[PDB]
């Protein structure tokens, strides 16, 4: 249904002119960044799961030219665009980050992965990470210097208002801040952890669930690239919060990631919305990109019935996981809430729990139906007391539970009870979460997103010509500049022939014209041919195909076997 087995690796390479600073290596910061991307892919390729990785490239240029490799751009195009990056612009970090997130969220509304107004599905994920490689240089615009990072809001994407942040559930921002000095640093190659950077990108990185890396040595660079390769995971960032008193600490608030394991991820129960749905609301309330999940450190019992579909999501290592595995209570669980998901309750009813594993090696989130301590006894009694033949009191209690039960859970609950073996338990009716106006707005957004996606995907080719001109001041007319595409057809155009080369080249074109008897009438030799791109210079495998085949008879590389 959704392919989470094809992770997106968006690279936001800083192409501001400050990336022309030279390290002690003799290479620029941009050269270090390109080498870092290449090393990252070399390290990633060791993992067999690396196949199907989508690699994307966005830069600090303007939106028509910011996207170098987006959707439906093959690996060779990515490599060619990476190799030819030039650092010649301003440090428009906020604008470029906005464009990168818009590129990531380009097709979300077309495919309905966000599941707006219908619960948040951790298995509806398109896992991407933005690895932005930059320096700590201050952010710049034409007007002046920006001391802080602020993503622009102008030109909003259709439906961008539905989530109150640009980044999404399944997106993480990582910053590789290059602080490599121009002098060979006297510090030893200490094996300590990588520091968090103090630039303006670090708050945005931490908010997204990622982190910033400060680099000032090639050894540190390798360490960050290895850690980044380890951080390419399919999962969604959950904003875990603490509710109630202790049983201002690192484990009180955390933007941790929960793992989602495919095989096509399979799941049933959504994360509750942050509002109670109604059929008379003209507009859908905006969503936080990371759901505020509240847990109570009470150590309740993790009740489970035999045949229920329960989604299990393994939390990544975090101080909260450290706390849970340090208290050492694998037989108890902390109830988990979403605030304002209920009709009236501010904290709302539980929908799941954190239960440490048997080995105390990991903590897993068990996503249950909404208000599961009330539903699960009833659901057990349905099949244990009367064998899916509901009684009057049971049906009344079930309906009473349904009053506290949000309509967006109706579909998953129907599917669950059907696969237990009681298909006729509830009325087969459409979910009452969304008004007609809301659904019409959603379909209009889907069409607009389709059109905008078509426009953006076709725009990544940079099929435009740079303004090769010098605007002449009075105290219209412009002075042209050399271009890449004006390859001199000196045989076909007499204006491309320099004066110093006029006579010999005249002889050459004369011979090319008259001596073509039983020969070849090509353009200028030594230009159209023998100025091949270096990549195709020694492509003997491709060259041998154009030659007739012969007769059969029976440290890394040096241009052949």
């Amino acid at each position: 249904y959704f392919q989470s087995n094809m992770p997106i690796l968006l690279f936001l390479i800083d192409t501001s002119a400050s990336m022309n600073q030279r390290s002690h290596l003799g290479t620029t910061y941009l050269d270090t960044a390109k080498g870092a991307v290449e090393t990252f892919m070399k390290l990633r390729a060791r993992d067999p799961a690396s196949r199907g990785d989508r690699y994307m490239l966005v830069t600090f240029e303007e939106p028509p030219y910011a996207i170098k490799a987006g959707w439906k751009e093959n690996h060779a195009t990515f490599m060619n665009e990476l190799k030819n990056l030039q650092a010649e612009g301003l440090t428009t970090l906020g604008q470029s980050l906005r464009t990168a997130f818009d590129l990531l969220n380009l097709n979300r509304l077309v495919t309905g992965i966000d599941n707006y107004g219908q619960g948040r599905n951790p298995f509806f994920l398109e896992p991407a990470i933005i690895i932005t490689i930059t320096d700590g240089s201050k952010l710049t615009t034409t007007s002046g210097v920006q001391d802080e990072l602020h993503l622009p809001l102008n030109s909003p994407l259709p439906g961008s208002e539905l989530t109150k942040e640009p980044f999404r559930w399944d997106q993480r921002l990582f910053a590789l801040v290059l602080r490599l000095p121009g002098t060979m640093s006297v510090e030893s190659e200490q094996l300590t952890g990588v520091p968090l950077d103090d630039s303006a990108i670090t708050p945005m990185c931490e908010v997204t669930g990622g982190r910033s890396y400060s680099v000032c040595s090639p050894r540190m660079l390798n360490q960050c690239l290895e850690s980044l390769v380890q951080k390419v995971q399919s999962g969604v960032v959950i904003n875990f919060e603490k509710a109630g008193p202790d049983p201002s600490q690192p484990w009180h608030s955390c933007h941790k990631l929960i793992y989602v394991r495919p095989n096509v991820p399979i799941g049933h129960w959504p994360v509750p919305e942050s509002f109670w749905p109604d059929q008379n609301s003209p507009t859908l309330p905006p969503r936080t990109s990371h759901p505020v999940v509240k847990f109570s450190c009470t150590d309740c019992e993790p009740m489970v019935i035999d045949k229920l579909p329960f989604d299990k999501y393994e939390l990544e290592p975090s101080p909260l996981t450290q706390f849970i595995l340090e208290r050492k209570s694998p037989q108890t669980c902390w109830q988990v809430y979403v605030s304002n998901s209920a009709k009236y309750s501010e904290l709302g009813h539980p929908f799941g729990y954190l239960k440490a594993s048997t080995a105390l090696n990991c903590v897993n989130l068990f996503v249950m139906p909404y208000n599961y301590p009330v539903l699960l006894p009833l659901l057990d009694d349905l099949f244990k007391v009367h064998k899916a033949k509901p009684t009057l009191k049971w049906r009344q209690s079930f309906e009473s539970y349904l009053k506290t039960m949000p309509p967006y859970y109706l579909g998953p609950l129907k599917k669950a009870v059907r696969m237990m073996g009681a298909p006729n338990l509830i009325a087969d009716s459409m979910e009452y979460g969304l008004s007609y106006s809301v659904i019409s707005y959603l379909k209009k957004l889907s069409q607009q997103a389709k059109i905008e996606s078509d426009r953006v995907i076709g725009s990544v080719g940079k099929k435009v010509v740079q303004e090769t001109g010098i605007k002449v001041r009075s105290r219209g007319f412009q002075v042209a500049l050399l271009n890449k595409d004006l390859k001199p057809q000196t045989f076909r155009n007499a204006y491309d022939i320099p004066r110093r080369n006029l006579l010999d080249h005249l002889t050459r074109m004369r011979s090319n014209l008259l001596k073509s008897t039983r020969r070849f009438l090509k353009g200028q030799d030594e230009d159209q041919v023998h100025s091949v791109p270096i990549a195709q210079m020694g492509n003997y495998q491709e060259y041998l195909k154009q030659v007739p085949s012969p007769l059969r008879e029976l440290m890394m590389i040096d241009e052949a076997d």
Binding site: Y1, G112, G411, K415, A427, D428, S429, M430, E431
Partner: peptide, 29 residues
Amino acid sequence: VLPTVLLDEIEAAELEGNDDRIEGVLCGA
């Protein structure tokens, strides 16, 4: 709402006699 159960679910919802249930499964299909 599975890829191999999208048509089956929307057809069972159509046969159930609900004029609104089909529209919900149509989006998933």
